[PDB]
Amino acid sequence: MTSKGEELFTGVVPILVELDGDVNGHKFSVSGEGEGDATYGKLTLKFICTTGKLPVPWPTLVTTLVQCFARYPDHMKQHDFFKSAMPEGYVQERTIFFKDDGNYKTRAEVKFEGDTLVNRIELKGIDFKEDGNILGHKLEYNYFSDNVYITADKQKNGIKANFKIRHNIEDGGVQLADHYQQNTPIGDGPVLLPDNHYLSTQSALSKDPNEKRDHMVLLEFVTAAGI
Numbered sequence: 001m002t003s004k005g006e007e008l009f010t011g012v013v014p015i016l017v018e019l020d021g022d023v024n025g026h027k028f029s030v031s032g033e034g035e036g037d038a039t040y041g042k043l044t045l046k047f048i049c050t051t052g053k054l055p056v057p058w059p060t061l062v063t064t065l066v067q068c069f070a071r072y073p074d075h076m077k078q079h080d081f082f083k084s085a086m087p088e089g090y091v092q093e094r095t096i097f098f099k100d101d102g103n104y105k106t107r108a109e110v111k112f113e114g115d116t117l118v119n120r121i122e123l124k125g126i127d128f129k130e131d132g133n134i135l136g137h138k139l140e141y142n143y144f145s146d147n148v149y150i151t152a153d154k155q156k157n158g159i160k161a162n163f164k165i166r167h168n169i170e171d172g173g174v175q176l177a178d179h180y181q182q183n184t185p186i187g188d189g190p191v192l193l194p195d196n197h198y199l200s201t202q203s204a205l206s207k208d209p210n211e212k213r214d215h216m217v218l219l220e221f222v223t224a225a226g227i
């Protein structure tokens with residue numbers, strides 16, 4: 001196999017996610033668990049707002065809350081930066097601009113802790129409208145899909161990406177979220193820097209009928225393409 005970290009994703013891998021957030025001074029934490037099967041590009045995750053009521057819409061946190069689980073086709077194995085940085089991991093940073101509203105700034109570490117792939121994230125949101133689509137909770141909760149456009153960032157021994165999410169507004173149009181992303185390896189080992197390509201990602205959101213806490217169940221597929 002073309003990286004050593006690739007070998008860690010051949011079977012089902014357990015996942016943990018920990019997020020601390022602050023959006024316009026509304027603080028919150030989210031804890032997630034589940035598993036990923038990179039063979040199929042398949043993620044099954046469940047998140048709990050551990051601070052009680054989430055002050056932003058669940059759909060707006062999906063992209064922040066493990067692209068190492070992408071399915072790369074055989075012909076594209078040399079373009080998988082994410083697995084190549086494992087097990088030491090990578091830093092993933094974003095700015096997410098919500099059109100006509102505020103932005104999220106995120107910093108995460110994605111790495112193995114024992115046998116578990118752990119995503120630890122700090123999120124800060126500023127300049128939101130208290131009655132806009134985000135803090136006013138005006139988004140639909142269901143499904144979204146888009147493409148993550150990835151390019152190499154050789155100067156940082158990593159990658160960049162950008163993409164746009166169209167979040168449906170309930171009885172409305174969409175709320176756009178323009179994402180800009182950077183990833184850099186945590187370790188000193190060699191990594192794979194890719195040619196331009198994209199991750200086709202579909203995120204289906206649901207509720208656990210036995211869960212009384214504020215929560216999100218996510219079923220997601222992530223597939224590399226474009227080469």
Ligand SMILES: [K+]
Pocket residue numbers: 056057058137138139140141
């Ligand atoms: K909502």
